[PDB]
C-alpha cells in the first residue's frame, strides 16, 4: 500500500556538511511523503538499539560514537515501496562506489561519513521508526499529491 | 546521423506535478535539440491509438483515462542516438526501480503515475511523431551546439 | 477569478541558448498553471503585430528579424497576477540592469538578446494571447496546485 | 553575536508543495545553522499565541484555522543577524510583490498562501521560539563552518 | 563593448566552503566569457596591493590574513557591462544585506567572510587583472555565444 | 593517506558549452578538495603527450585538433579513490552509454565532444598531473571538510 513508511537519519555528517535541505528535498520530489521529523543528538542507548545488528561487528564503537557525536535529523518518509526506494536515493554502503545521482554517490567519500541511513526492510524500518519517535510525533492520516498515485 | 528523432510526453501527472520544464531542461543540458513542442488535452483515439501496444493489457483502460484526464505536453527531440539517450534519461517503466538521476528515478512512485512516456525505438518515434505532430509543427532546419557534434 | 493570463515566448536566443526548460520551470514552480504551449518560428507578420507598438522605434526591424531569425516557444500562464509577476520574473529591458534572481538578470547581457519576451497588461495579454494562440489550443479547465490558493 | 536566533516555519502549504527541502536547503546555504527541527499540525491555541497580534485583525480567523489546518515544520536558524536575513530571503507578506530570489518571491502567488512565515524581530523571535520549542528540543553549543565568521 | 573585463575572486572562505563551481556557473550562465582562471594562496604583496585602498581602514590587517590564510581562485570574466554586472550579482559588502538571487545575499552571513571579490570599476578591473594574471594567462581570441550579442 | 590525486580537463566543448562550474561543482559538492585549476588552450605537444597513449590510433589527430583548439580549464582534485570516483562521475567514454547523473550522461551525446577528461588510473593521474602543471602551481595545504573523513 501507499502508507508504507521508512526511517531516515541525516547523520551528524550531512548535517555539519548542511545537506538536510537537500536531502529532504530529494524524498519530497520523489513524491514520498514527510510523517516524523526532528533534529535530535542521538543518545548512547539510541545509538547502539539503532545499530543492534552491528553490536558485534568491530566498527560499531566508531558507529555509535558518530552517530552520538552530533545532531541528527531522524525523519519518516511515507509511500509506495518507500524503503527500497529511499535506499536506492541513497546508494550502497561506501559512498565513492555509490553511482552518481544518489545521495551517497553525490556527496559521500568516507565509509564512515556516509551522509544518510535508511531502514533497510520494511521489518528494520518499523522498528527503527518506533526508537526515534514517539506515535504522537507521527503524521497519522496522510495525504500526497493526488499526481503520485493510481 | 545526429537527425534521429524521439517522441517524449510529460503525462498529465508530471505536469500537474510541475515537471514539465524540468524535462525539457534535462534534454537542452543533454544536448537534444526540441523539434517540436506542445500541450495538449489526448483525445481517447490518440492514447488509444498511442497505446495500441497494450490495448489487450488490464492497465489500458485505466492508462487511457489517466491519460486523457488532463494536459500532456508532448515534445520531439532530435540528435544522435537520442531514442535510446532518452529512455536512459527516463528510468523504467517502474519508477520505484528508476535509479536516481533519471527522470522517474527523482519523481516518481507508481507505474501508472509515471511522469514521462518516450519512444523505444526509431521505429515507435516515427509513428508516435507522425501521431502527435503535423509537419509544419517540427523544424526541418535543425542546428544543436557546434559544441555537440564532430 | 485568479485566472488571469499572460503570454510568455523564449525568444530564439534562449531556445538557442537551451534555456527553455530553465524558463518554464521557475513559471511552474512560482504556482502559474500552463495553459498553453508551442514552438514556432514566428512570421514577419505575427511578429510585427505582436511588436506592433514598436512598429516606429528604429530597432524594430531588426526586432523582428530576429524573432522570426528561429524558434520560439510560446506559452501562456495563467495565474493570479501572472501578468505583472512574470514581469517581475523577467527582469527589465536591459538584462544588464535586470537583477539576480529574475530571468534576464540570470541569463542576459545584450538588450537584443534578452531571452525572454512577456506581455506588460492584462490588456497586452489578452491580445498577445490572441495573437499566438488559437482558443482550441489554450485550456477551459485550470487546476493549479490546491496549496497555492485561498 | 553570531548566536543570534530566528524561527521559521513551513506553512501548511509550503509542507504540502514539497518545499521544505527547498526551504532548509537555503538557510544551510547562507551559513545559518539549525539548532531546533520538527514537524507539527499547529493546535488552535498555538496558532492565536503565535500570531497574537493579529488576533484583532480580520484575516486572524481564517490565518489561525489555515496554520492549523495542516503539518508545519517549525525551525529555528542561527547567526549573525539571523532574523533580519530570513525575513529578506522570505521576501513580503504578498509573494506577487516578493522579489525573484527570495522563498515567496520565487514560489508564492496567494498572501494566504504565502509558504513560510519567519520572526520579524529577535524580540519576536525569542518568544516565538519558546512558543513552539522546548529547551531540550533547541541545540545549546553550536558549530556553524568555520569559513562563515571571522 | 563586449570586450570589457572585470576581476573576480572566490575569497578563501568561498573556496572552502565549496562554492568555487557555483560562482563560475552564475558568470557562464549569465553570459560572461571566462578570459582567465587559477588557484593560487595570496602573497601578502598581492593581497595588500590587491586592497591598497583599505590600507589606512582597521578591517585591512584582518583582511589581508584573511585573503592569504588560503586558496582563491582569481578569474577574469569579459563582456558587455560585465564589471558593473558581476557587482551587481555579487550583492553589497555586508552578505546580510545582500539581496537573495546574489552570491553574498545566498551565500554570506560576515562581512569578513563575504565568499567574493570583485572590481568596482573598469579601471580597478583593469588594474587588478594586471595585477593577478599575466597576459598569457588570459585569451586574446574571446568568442561568446553568438545569442548574446546583437 | 587520502591525499589521492586525479586530473581533470573540462574540455574545449565543455567550457564553450558553460558547464565549467556545473563540473567543478560536482566534486566539490562530492568532498574533493581543488588542489590545482587553471585554463589554458593546450599546446599540441602537451596534447600529444597527454593523449600519447592513443598516437597510433586512428581518432588521434581530430582529438589533438580538438582539444587545442580552444580553452580547456585544467584542475586537480585531491581525495580518497578521487581518481576511480572522479571516473564513476564522469560516465563512460561514449556519452550516449553514460548513465544519467554522471557528467557525460547529463551533457553529452558525442563521442569526440565528451565535455571532459580524467585520469584512468593514480599511474596516470600522477603523469597527467605533472604533465600540466608545475609543483608550485598545487597545494601543499590541503583541509577538506572534517565531515567528510573519519
Ligand atoms: N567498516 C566500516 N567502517 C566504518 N563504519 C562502517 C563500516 N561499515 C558500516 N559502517 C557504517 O555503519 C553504518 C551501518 O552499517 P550498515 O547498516 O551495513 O550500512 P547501511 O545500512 O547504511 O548500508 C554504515 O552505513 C556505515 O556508516
Ligand atoms: N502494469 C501496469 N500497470 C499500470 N500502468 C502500467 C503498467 N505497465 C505500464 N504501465 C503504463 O502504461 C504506459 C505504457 O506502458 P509501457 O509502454 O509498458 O511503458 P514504458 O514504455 O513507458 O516503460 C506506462 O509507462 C505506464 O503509465
Ligand atoms: N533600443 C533597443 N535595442 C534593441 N532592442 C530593443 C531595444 N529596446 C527594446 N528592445 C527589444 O525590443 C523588445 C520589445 O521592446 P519592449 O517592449 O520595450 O521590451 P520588453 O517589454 O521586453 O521590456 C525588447 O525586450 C528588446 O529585445
Ligand atoms: N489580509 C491577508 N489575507 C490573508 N492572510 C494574511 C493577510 N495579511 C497577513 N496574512 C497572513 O498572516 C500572516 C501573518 O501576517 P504578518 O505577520 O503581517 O505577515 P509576515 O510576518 O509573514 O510578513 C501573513 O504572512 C499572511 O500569511
Ligand atoms: N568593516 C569591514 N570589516 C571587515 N571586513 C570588511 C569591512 N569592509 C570591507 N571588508 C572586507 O574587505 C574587502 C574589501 O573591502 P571593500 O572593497 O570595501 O568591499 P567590496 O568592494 O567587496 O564591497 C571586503 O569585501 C571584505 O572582505
Ligand atoms: N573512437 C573515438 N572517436 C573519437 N574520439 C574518441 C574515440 N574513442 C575515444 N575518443 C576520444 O579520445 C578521448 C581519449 O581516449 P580515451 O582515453 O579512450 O577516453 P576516456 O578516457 O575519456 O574515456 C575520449 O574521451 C574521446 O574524446
Ligand atoms: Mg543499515
Ligand atoms: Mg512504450
Ligand atoms: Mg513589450
Ligand atoms: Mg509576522
Ligand atoms: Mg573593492
Ligand atoms: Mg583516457
Redesign the interface.
Same mark, same amino acid.
Given at each position: 500500500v501507499?502508507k508504507e513508511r521508512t526511517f531516515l537519519a541525516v547523520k551528524?555528517?550531512?548535517?555539519?556538511?548542511?545537506?538536510?535541505?537537500?536531502?529532504?528535498?530529494?524524498?519530497?520530489?520523489?513524491?514520498?511523503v514527510?510523517?516524523?521529523?526532528?533534529?535530535?543528538?542521538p543518545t548512547k542507548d539510541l545509538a547502539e538499539s539503532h545499530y543492534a545488528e552491528h553490536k558485534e561487528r568491530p566498527f560499531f564503537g /566508531?558507529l555509535v560514537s558518530?552517530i552520538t557525536s552530533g =545532531?541528527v535529523?531522524a525523519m519518516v518518509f511515507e &509511500?509506495?515501496? %518507500?524503503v527500497?526506494?529511499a535506499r536506492?536515493?541513497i /546508494?550502497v554502503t561506501n559512498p565513492?562506489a555509490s553511482? =552518481?545521482?544518489?545521495?551517497r554517490?553525490?556527496? &559521500?567519500?568516507? %565509509?564512515?561519513?556516509n551522509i544518510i541511513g535508511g531502514s533497510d526492510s520494511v521489518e528494520s524500518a518499523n522498528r527503527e521508526i518506533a526508537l526515534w519517535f514517539k506515535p504522537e510525533?507521527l503524521?497519522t492520516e496522510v495525504?500526497p499529491?493526488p499526481?503520485?498515485?493510481?
Open positions: 501507499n551528524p555528517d550531512g548535517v555539519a556538511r548542511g545537506l538536510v535541505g537537500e536531502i529532504i528535498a530529494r524524498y519530497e520530489k520523489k513524491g514520498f514527510l510523517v516524523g521529523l526532528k533534529q535530535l543528538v /566508531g558518530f =545532531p535529523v &509511500g509506495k515501496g %518507500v527500497a526506494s536506492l536515493m /546508494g565513492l553511482a =552518481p545521482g544518489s545521495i554517490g553525490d556527496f &559521500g567519500v568516507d %565509509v564512515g561519513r510525533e503524521l495525504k499529491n499526481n503520485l498515485y493510481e
